[PDB]
Design a protein around this ligand. Structure first.
Ligand SMILES: Nc1ncnc2c1ncn2[C@@H]1O[C@H](COP(=O)(O)OP(=O)(O)OP(=O)(O)O)[C@@H](O)[C@H]1O
Ligand SMILES: [Mg+2]
Ligand SMILES: [Mg+2]
Ligand SMILES: [Mg+2]
Ligand SMILES: [Mg+2]
Ligand SMILES: [Mg+2]
Ligand SMILES: [Mg+2]
Ligand SMILES: [Mg+2]
Ligand code: NA
Lengths: 152, 79, 177, 66, 114
RNA sequence: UCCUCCUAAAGAGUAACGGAGGAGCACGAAGGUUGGCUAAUCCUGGUCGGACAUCAGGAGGUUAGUGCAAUGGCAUAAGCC
RNA sequence: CCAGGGCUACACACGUGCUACAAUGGCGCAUACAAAGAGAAGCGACCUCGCGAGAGCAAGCGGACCUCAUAAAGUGCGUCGUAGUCCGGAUUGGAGUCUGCAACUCGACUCCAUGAAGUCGGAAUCGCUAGUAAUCGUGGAUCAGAAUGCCACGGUGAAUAC
């Protein structure tokens, strides 16, 4: 059982998005029409659907990988957004080892502790922190992304 | 702070100081006045200020002109 | 080098006249400059050493050599081989360029300047100085850096004695007292 | 040198706040205009104006308008 | 967007931008805009650079962030070493303007400690 | 069971429930070769820096070092790249 | 009898209030609607000077006539567009005014600068049934000066009580 606990560097007070309209439909009829909603610093909002409804593209247009055809989103200017993307293969590239990968993050931290400790707190070892991070598989990559979230 | 004019100090202080400056540096000046500010002519003296039970001697340096004689005698103690 | 030409055209004759020398090669001459800084904090983070190396590579047009600990000590909890300091050696043309671009612009820029100490020789004609602020050099623009990390300048000269070193450096209008 | 292991090094033309144009080969990539150089630094003029802080005995006599 | 220390704030009206300077409040800032010939309601981005140089010279006549730090710090350092009553409160860490310390004065004493 | 020093009486060997310590490994380089280099500890100067981190000068000279206990040895280095 | 000092001392705990955490809010400009009361070593117009506290000259009033004394929330217009902010005002430095022989311990107020904690508050606890609660101002008692206290006056003005 790994020990993961995402903290908060700064607390947000009023709201996050206040989204009004996106009008986002790739090629066919838009999978959603209006989608005007707020958060008031809410929680969860577990979007669900079948295989092919558009949750991931909605999230991409929400974060900024893509943008809506017409409308705006706008975040709170003090926010900090972590993203566990649907696909994580564009991240694990360029022949970076585990240690270098998880050290490329961090704001003001030490390159020996809090980057080599955040790894040990989730089922990783001295042997692990030296193998290339590209040859990891599945749950290891997911835990790497969770570690990046905790670090950020 | 106080008023426009007339920095108020007591006669029984200026008169004592005038004889003190004439002779030169001497014994401490024993006074019971705390409400009299410090004029430029009193530098180099050793006036003593009443604190409620005794007199603590004080030597007038260059910066001690804008405050009265009672501003350099802590009137009560701590610890 | 403007300072090299100034040396060989004025300082040689000035020093021979002032000191009653027999040979033109008896005159004290500056032979090298050394810029270093032992970061110390690199124990728990190696990237700070690389940042320091970039700082010195900007300050002087060379690549710093990363120097390791000579012996282990438990006072500061270091071992042998740990990279601790960075150092740059300048001789000749680049040494003259750094000398000029220090003593003509960088020295005035230091906050609250009064004059470099004259009693800071090692009794053998050499000189040493600390800057305490890496941002007085124009190569650093106060936006790239993250610290106030300082540098040590060490002027190694041929001067036989500290008095001759003082005279030689005063010939270059060094900001003494 | 060692065949492109060092930063770039090209001649620049820096000037003071009163002119004093100088050519110094440095690693900046663009020239700069700065404050007084060693020529114009007031470490030999305002020395008295630097060690001058103080004064209240005279500042009371101007207050003494009587 | 630059003054002596930094005029970082854009999107701010002129009279409020110079308040970011350590040494300029509101009426002192109001004298900068009115005397130098700039309207109060102008947004910083819309101004030109030429007007800034007029601003930079005008503000620099005051004592500001660069030297206002020394003015207050040395003044206290005089009283601290003066032996004056007001100095002793600065030495101890108590209110100096003759106010209550029996139950209040948390601001000078910092957060409550047992 | 094996290794090192003394007892061991200046060749070798030599005992006691005599006096002191170690091993049951390690290394694909920590081996071969070629090229190069020389230590500990102190003084004076130097931003944080400190009794000792990093830099420059001097004295000293192998009192350093040797993957591992001790003896012998090592500058032509057997030590460091 | 007198001079100075203390009741204003502060690691801490409690009770009663005030000011705030802001957008049904701040800031600038302009304009309406009251009531009650005090004034003789006292209230003080108007005028001028001062950025402002105030200073100089100074009529009238021992008064339904004169003064204190321009009510404030409101309304209309503009900006601020959710930040420790154009909220908040503590703390502190400098220069001031006036009372009183005297403002350091220890007054009030104004000007410039600084701008903290605080982003609806744990167990628990308090007030109120109609011009009441909530909120906004005004006056007086004591008093040379010195109240967010107390005593009184008026504006706006609710929800619910099965
Ligand atoms: N590149 C694309 N081309 C065509 N259709 C797309 C594309 N990306 C998304 N979609 C459509 O958008 C719908 C919703 O997007 P999304 O990928 O989140 O769907 P999902 O199947 O619910 O999610 P996921 O499988 O990623 O967990 C999909 O069902 C699909 O029809
Ligand atoms: Mg034998
Ligand atoms: Mg024998
Ligand atoms: Mg035998
Ligand atoms: Mg070997
Ligand atoms: Mg060899
Ligand atoms: Mg070998
Ligand atoms: Mg009492
Ligand atoms: Na999806």
């Amino acid at each position: 059982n790994p020990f993961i606990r995402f903290e908060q560097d700064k607390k947000l007070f009023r709201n996050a998005l206040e989204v009004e309209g996106l009008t986002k439909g790739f090629d066919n009829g838009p999978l959603f029409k209006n989608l005007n909603l707020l958060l008031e610093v809410g929680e969860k909002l577990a979007v669900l659907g079948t295989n092919g409804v558009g949750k991931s593209t909605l999230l991409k247009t929400l974060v900024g990988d893509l943008q809506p055809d017409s409308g705006t989103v706008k975040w709170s200017e003090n926010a900090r957004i972590g993203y566990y993307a649907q696909d994580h293969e564009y991240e694990f590239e360029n022949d970076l080892t585990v240690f270098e990968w998880m050290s490329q993050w961090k704001q003001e931290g030490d390159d020996e502790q809090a980057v080599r400790s955040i790894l040990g707190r989730l089922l990783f070892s001295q042997d692990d922190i030296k193998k290339p991070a590209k040859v990891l598989s599945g749950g290891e990559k997911g835990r790497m992304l969770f570690g990046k979230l905790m670090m950020q | 702070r106080s008023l426009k004019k007339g920095p108020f100090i007591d006669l029984h202080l200026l008169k004592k100081v005038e004889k003190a400056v004439e002779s030169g540096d001497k014994k401490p000046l024993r006074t019971w006045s705390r409400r009299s500010t410090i004029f430029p002519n009193m530098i180099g003296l050793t006036i003593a200020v009443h604190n409620g039970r005794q007199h603590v001697p004080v030597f007038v340096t260059d910066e001690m002109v804008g405050h009265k004689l009672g501003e350099f005698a802590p009137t009560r103690t701590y610890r | 080098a403007k300072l090299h030409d100034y040396y060989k055209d004025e300082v040689v004759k000035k020093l021979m006249t002032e000191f009653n020398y027999n040979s033109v090669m008896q005159v004290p001459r500056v032979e090298k400059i050394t810029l270093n800084m032992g970061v110390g904090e690199a124990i728990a983070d190696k990237k700070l050493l690389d940042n320091a190396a970039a700082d010195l590579a900007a300050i002087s047009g060379q690549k710093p050599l990363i120097t390791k600990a000579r012996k282990s000590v438990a006072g500061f909890k270091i071992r042998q081989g740990y990279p601790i300091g960075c150092k740059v050696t300048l001789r000749g043309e680049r040494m003259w360029e750094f000398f000029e671009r220090l003593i003509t612009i960088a020295v005035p820029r230091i906050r609250d300047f009064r004059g470099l100490s004259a009693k800071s020789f090692d009794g053998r004609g050499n000189y040493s100085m600390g800057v305490r602020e890496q941002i007085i050099f124009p190569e650093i623009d106060y936006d790239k850096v993250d610290r106030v990390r300082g540098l040590d300048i060490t002027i190694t000269t041929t001067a036989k004695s500290d008095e001759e070193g003082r005279a030689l450096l005063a010939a270059f209008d060094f900001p003494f007292r | 040198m060692k065949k492109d292991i060092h930063p770039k090094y090209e001649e620049i033309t820096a000037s003071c706040s009163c002119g004093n144009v100088m050519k110094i080969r440095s690693t900046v990539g663009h020239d700069l205009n700065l404050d007084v150089c060693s020529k114009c630094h007031p470490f030999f003029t305002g020395k008295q104006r630097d060690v001058a802080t103080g004064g209240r005995v005279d500042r009371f006599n101007k207050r003494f308008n009587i | 967007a630059r003054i002596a220390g930094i005029n970082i704030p854009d999107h701010k009206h002129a009279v409020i931008a110079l308040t970011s300077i350590y040494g300029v409040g509101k009426t002192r800032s109001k004298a900068i805009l009115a005397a130098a010939g700039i309207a109060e309601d102008v947004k910083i981005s819309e101004l030109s650079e030429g007007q800034i140089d007029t601003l930079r010279d005008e503000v620099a006549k005051f004592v500001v962030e660069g030297d206002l730090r020394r003015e207050i710090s040395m003044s206290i350092k005089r009283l601290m070493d003066l032996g004056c009553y007001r100095g002793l409160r600065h030495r101890r860490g108590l209110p100096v303007r003759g106010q209550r310390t029996k139950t209040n004065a948390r601001t000078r004493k910092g957060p409550r400690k047992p």
